[PDB]
Structures are given as C-alpha cells and as structure tokens.
Design an enzyme around this catalytic site. Structure first.
Site, PDB file in Angstrom:
ATOM      1  N   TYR B  51     -23.475  16.953   4.557  1.00 51.94           N
ATOM      2  CA  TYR B  51     -22.248  17.770   4.621  1.00 51.94           C
ATOM      3  C   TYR B  51     -22.466  19.101   3.912  1.00 51.94           C
ATOM      4  CZ  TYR B  51     -18.120  16.192   7.158  1.00 51.94           C
ATOM      5  OH  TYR B  51     -17.210  15.919   8.149  1.00 51.94           O
ATOM      6  N   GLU B  53     -20.104  22.106   4.412  1.00 55.80           N
ATOM      7  CA  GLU B  53     -18.981  23.018   4.652  1.00 55.80           C
ATOM      8  C   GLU B  53     -19.130  24.234   3.751  1.00 55.80           C
ATOM      9  OE1 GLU B  53     -15.371  20.858   3.942  1.00 55.80           O
ATOM     10  OE2 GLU B  53     -15.394  19.923   5.926  1.00 55.80           O
ATOM     11  N   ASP B 197     -20.130  38.656  25.290  1.00 59.60           N
ATOM     12  CA  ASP B 197     -20.616  37.284  25.342  1.00 59.60           C
ATOM     13  C   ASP B 197     -21.955  37.313  26.080  1.00 59.60           C
ATOM     14  OD1 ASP B 197     -21.161  34.598  25.785  1.00 59.60           O
ATOM     15  OD2 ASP B 197     -19.139  34.116  26.507  1.00 59.60           O
ATOM     16  N   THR B 223     -24.684  31.610  23.254  1.00 62.63           N
ATOM     17  CA  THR B 223     -25.231  30.279  23.083  1.00 62.63           C
ATOM     18  C   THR B 223     -26.680  30.444  22.649  1.00 62.63           C
ATOM     19  OG1 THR B 223     -25.788  30.259  25.436  1.00 62.63           O
ATOM     20  CG2 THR B 223     -23.731  29.168  24.761  1.00 62.63           C
ATOM     21  N   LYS B 226     -29.671  28.968  26.425  1.00 61.41           N
ATOM     22  CA  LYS B 226     -29.950  29.441  27.788  1.00 61.41           C
ATOM     23  C   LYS B 226     -31.294  30.191  27.837  1.00 61.41           C
ATOM     24  CE  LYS B 226     -25.034  29.370  29.114  1.00 61.41           C
ATOM     25  NZ  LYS B 226     -24.632  28.910  27.762  1.00 61.41           N
ATOM     26  N   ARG B 232     -28.891  23.292  21.819  1.00 63.22           N
ATOM     27  CA  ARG B 232     -27.532  23.497  22.292  1.00 63.22           C
ATOM     28  C   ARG B 232     -26.595  23.862  21.129  1.00 63.22           C
ATOM     29  NH1 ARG B 232     -25.731  22.761  27.391  1.00 63.22           N
ATOM     30  NH2 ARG B 232     -27.876  22.083  27.883  1.00 63.22           N
TER      31      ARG B 232
END
Lengths: 405, 405
Positions: B51, B53, B197, B223, B226, B232
């Site tokens: 974790y 955060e 984008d 992303t 691609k 991903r």
C-alpha cells in the site's frame, strides 16, 4: 527473475530491496497481506497484451475466447465464495468498485449516508476531497462514544432525517462485527439502497468468520487484496436485478479495457480462498488479532471498543500521552510497520491522531501464531513506554529481527 | 511458470491457450502490442503487496522507501521521454487518466469540446453512456467529409459557439497527424484549457515520429500499453502549475492505492522507450503502416483520409458493399484480428459500421516488415473479395500460418 535484472538494473535493485524489506519487517498495516507465487505468476502473464472491453461472450474485440474463460472462472468462483447472484471482477481498485456502484444508483448531488470517516469510514465513503464527497451529498452516522460500536439508532435517525438514496455500511478501521440485518432494516424503512463495502473483511466473510453482507445488501463492493489475500484490484457483487446496470456502470460507464492478467490473478486468489486451508488461515487471523488485543491490554494499552471481532484493532494512545504519529514513527525505527489512525472522537487532527491501527492478516500469512502475538505486544510495550531510550529501541530491533528470523 | 500450473490447472490452461493464440494470429487491433519479458516480470513482482497511497516522499504508509524509488524512476523517465514538467504515473488506465484531468479543471455540467466519436474520438471524450458525457456537457468537432482530416475551422467555430472550459484533442481512430499548435491557438482564443489524449500515438511521439503535444497542451493523457508498448495503465503529463492539482485529482480524488507493480513495469517500458532501438522500432511501425496502406490500395481498397501518417489505418468498405462487422467476422475465420470501425459520416450504426481499423504496432514488434505488409494486404484482398468461398478462406488460413510460422 531472468530478464528484468539485465534489462533494468535500477528497477530490479529497487524491487529486490522491497522484497527483502517485506521479509525483514513486522507488517502490521491492517490492509496488507502477502500473495502466493501463483497469484504473482498470473499477474506477470501475457494477458496484459489483450484488449477485452465488454464481458465474456459479449466483447468488443475478437480473440477473447480464452480471457473469457479466465474472467468466467473469476466470476463463478466469486459467486461460490460469497453466494452472490452476480459478480463483476473488472474494477481496477476498491475506489473504482465503489465509484461504479455510486454511478449506477445515484445522480449528482444525491444524499448518501456513510460511516463517519473519523470513526472508521473510508475516504470513498464521502471525504470532501474525494470524488464521493464532491459528487454526492454525504452525511455520517457515528459509533457510541463509550463502546465505540456503531450506534444503530444514530444510523436510523440520520437515515430518517436526511432521506439518503443510498446507505453505505463497512469500514477501513472498525474492529467489531457489523450488523448488516440492521442496516437493511433501516434502509428498508427509508426506501434506500444498501451498499456494503467489505474490502477489509472479505477474506473473513469467505471463511464464515464474519456475517455475510450478500443476503442483506443490494450491492457489495470489495478489494481483492486485503484479508482475501488476492492481487490488487476491486470487485462488485450484487443481486441479479442489478447485474446489467452494474456491468454497464463499469463499462462503458467508468472504465475501459479491464486488466485481464489481474483478473487471472483474481481467479487464482478465489481458488485459493475456496480451499479448506484458507479457512484455517482466516481463523488464525482472527485468533491472532484477539490474542494480540489481549496481550496489548496486558501491557497496559487501551483498545478502541475494548478489543476486536476481526483482523484489526486500534490502540487509543491517550493514556500514554502519545500521538499516533509519534508511535508510528518510533515503531518504524525498530522495524514494526503500523498506521497512525484517528480514534472515535479524536481530539487530534487526522494528520496527527491519538491512535494506531494494527492488523494480523500479513503476519498470519507468514506463519505467526499466538506466541508471536504475545512477543509483538511485548515489543510494542517496550517501545512505546521507552520512546526516549535508544537502548530500549535497539533491544526492540533485536527482538523484531528474532521474529522475522 | 512454476507455481501456477500446480496451484490452478484451469487458469493455467486458459493462459497457455491465450499465449499460443497470441503467437498464431495476425494481430492488427491498432491499440494492441506485445510487452517484453522484463515488463511482465515487473508486473509479476512482490510490489503488489505494498500500500502506497500518496506520492514519493509524501506517502500515507511507512515502508515506501523502495516503491518510492520505482515510482520516481517512472516519473523521471517519462519526463525524459516527453519533456513534460510533471508526470503522474498512478492512473490505473487511460479512462482514469482522463477522468482525473476532467476532475481537476471541470465542474459537473461544464462544456467540453472533443472529437466526434464517429470520426475518431474516444468513448471517454463524451459518450452519453460514459461518465464523460454523463458528467459533462460534451460538444463535438468533425473531420472534412472528403479528406477526413480534422476541420480546424469547425474546431474553432464549435469552440466560439459553445465556449467550452476544456478542449480535447486526440483520437482512437484518426490516421493523420494532429496539429496541436492549432488546437492551442483555438483554446487560447476562447480561454479554454487544452488536453491532448495521446494514448494511441504515445510511442510515436516518444520516437519523434509525431509532433509532441506537451509544449502545446496544459494536460496530456495517455495509456502506457499501445504504441508505447508498456503495461496496461495510464499516465498524465502536465505543466508544473497543475502538478499539485493533478496529483490531488488522482489521490485522494479518484483513486486509492496505486498499483506499484504496474508502476514498476511502467518504469521498465519507459526505459525501453528511451533506447535507440525503440526509435528504430517506432519508425518501422510507421513505415509498415504506410506500406500496408499502399498495398491495400493496390488491392483496390479505399482508405479513410487516403492513407496514414501514423500506426493505424481505416478501410472504407462501402466500395466492396461490405459492413465492418462482416469483414471483422470473416477475417477472424482465417486468423486475422481487426476491429469493425465507424468511418466518418458512416451510414451504418456503430454496432455494424462500414469500416475496419488496422494498426501495425503489434506485428512490427514480432518482427514483420515491408514484405509481410504486402502479404497481409494480399490476404485481406483474397478474403474480402471472396467471402463466400471456403477454398479462398482456407488458402488465406494457410498464408496466415505461413506468416506466423
């Protein structure tokens, strides 16, 4: 690893540091655990290469025959585990699982009733700096100031006054069993949906050690990575009447391509949870938490609610005149990892706090038992009673190392 | 794999099917690629257990020293790759990257101007079934009906009429270079933010084969999976003046714990992209797309915009009196994977379409070159000109197998 060390020395060196850190420290962060090698292998698979927007048998890309099998295994095993009518295993996280449910049943500005964030409620249950509190009108119910148990008459009064469209039950820092039947009764009285966010307790629910919210809730959200001991991600369970809407909320609603490799890992984790030995593990988690709670009390510590029914506990440090921040810092110095945590009716800010949150899921996974719980409690006592003694801290350091080997 | 086969025969069998599928088929889905073994190893690491955060040096959990190193490597390499003032490598997906930018600068109901979804715009650029179109008031600019190039006077007119707070440039299915300078000029005229984008073209931008939006845009989303050939996930790049707000939008705004193992994989992919051989790869992607485009035209096909400047092309199947759905289906029968795709001013629904979308990123990664492009085009011609001939389809099947070995 074979290829990473040669391709990326920098990333590999850091990963190796983290791997050694995970072995050396006593991990008491209540939300953490250690996944199996099988789970990790699934995450490290070629499934990352596959675009699979949509659902099994209803995708928007060809070639999904095999990722469909994987996602269906995840869904069916989840239904076996929790007895839900429908599962959606695509949420990228607990945040996204919650986001999708809110997107399904709420409109911008609708009123939602959740657990007080300083009493155990999660950020995504209405924080004014989180999408939940910004997008929806969140009101809060509290725990009793003495017992620290959810005040169900307060839940009811808040529901009747504010008329929420949705009531959220479940918590990131609540050490007692939640009465889902009572939540549903209150929801029914005011004509509200009930969502249960079981992220913390999902593994205990799967093992029959906490009541199952599934029969009582319209929606159940969860992470796959806490007591469920799976990969990092989310999941939604719901009644069949909401299946279509929930699926549409995840895609095309709030996400795009799912993480098929993580979904594979989810299936693996669910498979593990279905085994008898996971049930034995989960009982040890709860047994260890109770033992740790008792041992801490023996050392003179006050616990929020006076103990625990689950995997986690909160120490109220006010009797020792310590802040959670101070305790967290000094425990870090000796190799014990905890969180500072707001205790109910905490006089301190959420950035300082009067408490620490502790969970046993991770140490139980590494094979710690009752004797180890006693020693962890004794080390915490040694440290927090002697924060100004470097010799005490070095002793603690040595005892921590003895535990991790 | 060592542990998965024994732990979970069902999941392993399906993964192995998918792995063999990835080798056997000619993958022309424009958004797909094949990641390196190093990237996969990073994703399959113990970092899933952590974790974290918050951000490097500013986390809400102890023990993040080493995951901090990893995240900083990702951020610094991203800045090296794209020349951005700030990077946020935490977004779980392209959807979440976009969601965070919208959350940063927009209020519920604000007007946003994006690319027409039937002309190449993405779902998250204003679909009425996506959060973007539900949460914000999206208006659209179009491509020219003859040239299929973005009509910049239409961008300007829509901007001046509708007065958007934000203009979005970039596409999921646009085969030509986008003029970011013109977008920024229009944005400046109407006092709107500009978001680009670049998900599809990110690898080409990194290789200097498409103009970089970073100098022109307030925000750039992408992303990592691609043309960038990474794991991903998502990423946001922005000017330093928005760094704090963007980071807060991701957490505590829209996400919780980041996927530290995926972030490790992101760092690895960025490291790969910084290498000279990635630049050579990206040029082959573009060269292959141009060659494939030319070869398809030689076979008698009409292409949207008359060709391509990037990794992708769209075939307008109207001259052959075929729908994209029909073409997609029959190509699947012979082992060629494409998407049906709406062409600008398509007479058919988005569920049927008059086109197919094709990209070269994946086949280029597997080492296909100009000769292979010629053969792919020839096979597509054979198939689409003979949809009712099983012998033609079997020949196609054999030629596909010859290519993949």
């Amino acid at each position: 690893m074979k290829y990473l060390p040669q391709q990326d020395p920098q990333v590999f060196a850091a990963i190796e540091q983290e791997r050694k850190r995970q072995h050396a420290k006593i991990e008491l962060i209540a939300s953490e655990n250690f996944v199996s090698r099988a789970v990790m292998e699934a995450q490290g698979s070629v499934l990352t290469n596959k675009y699979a927007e949509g659902y099994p048998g209803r995708r928007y890309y060809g070639g999904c025959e095999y990722v469909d099998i994987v996602e269906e295994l995840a869904r069916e095993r989840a239904k076996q585990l929790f007895g839900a009518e429908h599962a959606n295993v695509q949420p990228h996280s607990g945040a996204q699982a919650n986001m999708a449910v809110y997107f399904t049943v709420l409109e911008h500005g609708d009123t939602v009733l959740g657990m007080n964030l300083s009493h155990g409620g999660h950020l995504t249950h209405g924080s004014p700096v989180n999408f939940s509190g910004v997008q929806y009108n969140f009101v809060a119910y509290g725990v009793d100031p003495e017992t620290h148990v959810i005040d169900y008459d307060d839940v009811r009064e808040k529901a009747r006054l504010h008329r929420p469209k949705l009531i959220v039950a479940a918590a990131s820092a609540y050490p007692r069993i939640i009465d889902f039947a009572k939540f549903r009764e209150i929801a029914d009285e005011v004509g509200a949906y009930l969502m249960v966010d079981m992220a913390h307790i999902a593994g205990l629910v799967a093992a029959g050690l906490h009541p199952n919210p599934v029969p009582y809730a319209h929606f159940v959200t969860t992470t796959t990575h806490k007591t469920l001991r799976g990969p990092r991600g989310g999941m939604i369970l719901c009644q069949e009447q909401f299946a279509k809407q929930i699926d549409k909320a995840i895609f095309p609603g709030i996400q795009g391509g799912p993480l098929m490799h993580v979904i594979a890992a989810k299936a693996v984790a669910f498979g593990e949870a279905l085994q008898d030995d996971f049930k034995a593990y989960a009982k040890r988690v709860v047994d260890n938490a109770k033992r740790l709670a008792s041992a801490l009390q023996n050392e003179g510590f006050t616990l929020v609610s006076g103990g625990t029914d689950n995997h986690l506990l909160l120490v109220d440090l006010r009797p020792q005149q310590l802040t959670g921040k101070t305790a967290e810092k000094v425990l870090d110095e000796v190799g014990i990892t905890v969180n500072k945590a707001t205790i109910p009716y905490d006089p301190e800010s959420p950035f300082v706090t009067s408490g620490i949150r502790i969970g046993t899921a991770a140490v139980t996974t590494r094979g710690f038992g009752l004797e180890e719980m006693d020693e962890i409690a004794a080390i915490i006592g040694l440290v927090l009673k002697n924060v100004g003694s470097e010799q005490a801290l070095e002793e603690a350091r040595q005892r921590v190392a003895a535990l991790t080997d």
